[PDB]
Amino acid sequence: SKPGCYDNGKHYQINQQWERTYLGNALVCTCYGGSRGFNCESKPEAEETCFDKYTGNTYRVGDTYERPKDSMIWDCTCIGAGRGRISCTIANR
């Protein structure tokens, strides 16, 4: 039994922050203890906005917007966050 935070082959102390990588991309990490653990995250850069490479409009992350494409309707969601994860899944109903 012993607390601490082992990452990147280093021995940091709880409540400590360090820089890592998720597979192969920037990814910071913050220790919360031996029980809470740590939650990594990519170099923050203001999360709350889109672009819509399709046309290039402005949409928030807290709002959905359908997008008619082809003979199939989908409900695209401005799931930017990290950058742009606009998920478009067929209508629920």
From Swiss-Prot:
Function of the molecule: Fibronectins bind cell surfaces and various compounds including collagen, fibrin, heparin, DNA, and actin. Fibronectins are involved in cell adhesion, cell motility, opsonization, wound healing, and maintenance of cell shape. Involved in osteoblast compaction through the fibronectin fibrillogenesis cell-mediated matrix assembly process, essential for osteoblast mineralization. Participates in the regulation of type I collagen deposition by osteoblasts. Acts as a ligand for the LILRB4 receptor, inhibiting FCGR1A/CD64-mediated monocyte activation. Secreted by contracting muscle, induces liver autophagy, a degradative pathway for nutrient mobilization and damage removal, and systemic insulin sensitization via hepatic ITGA5:ITGB1 integrin receptor signaling.
Domain of life the protein comes from: Eukaryota
Name of the protein: Fibronectin
Pathological association: Glomerulopathy with fibronectin deposits 2: Genetically heterogeneous autosomal dominant disorder characterized clinically by proteinuria, microscopic hematuria, and hypertension that leads to end-stage renal failure in the second to fifth decade of life.
Range of the intact protein held here: 48 to 140 of 2477
Post-translational modification: Sulfated. Forms covalent cross-links mediated by a transglutaminase, such as F13A or TGM2, between a glutamine and the epsilon-amino group of a lysine residue, forming homopolymers and heteropolymers (e.g. fibrinogen-fibronectin, collagen-fibronectin heteropolymers).
Quaternary structure, from the entry: Mostly heterodimers or multimers of alternatively spliced variants, connected by 2 disulfide bonds near the carboxyl ends; to a lesser extent homodimers. Interacts with FBLN1, AMBP, TNR, LGALS3BP and COL13A1. Interacts with FBLN7. Interacts with COMP. Interacts (via type III repeats 9-14) with TNFAIP6 (via CUB domain); this interaction enhances fibronectin fibril assembly. TNFAIP6 may act as a bridging molecule between FN1 and THBS1. Interacts with TNR; the interaction inhibits cell adhesion and neurite outgrowth. Interacts with FST3 and MYOC. Interacts with SVEP1. (Microbial infection) Interacts with S.aureus FnbA.
Source lineage: Eukaryota, Metazoa, Chordata, Craniata, Vertebrata
Subcellular location: Secreted, Extracellular space, Extracellular matrix; Secreted
Tissues expressing this chain: Expressed in the inner limiting membrane and around blood vessels in the retina (at protein level). Plasma FN (soluble dimeric form) is secreted by hepatocytes. Cellular FN (dimeric or cross-linked multimeric forms), made by fibroblasts, epithelial and other cell types, is deposited as fibrils in the extracellular matrix. Ugl-Y1, Ugl-Y2 and Ugl-Y3 are found in urine.
Region (Required for binding to LILRB4): 76-93
Disulfide bonds: 5-31, 29-40, 50-78, 76-88
Residue span, Fibronectin type-I domain: 3-43, 48-91
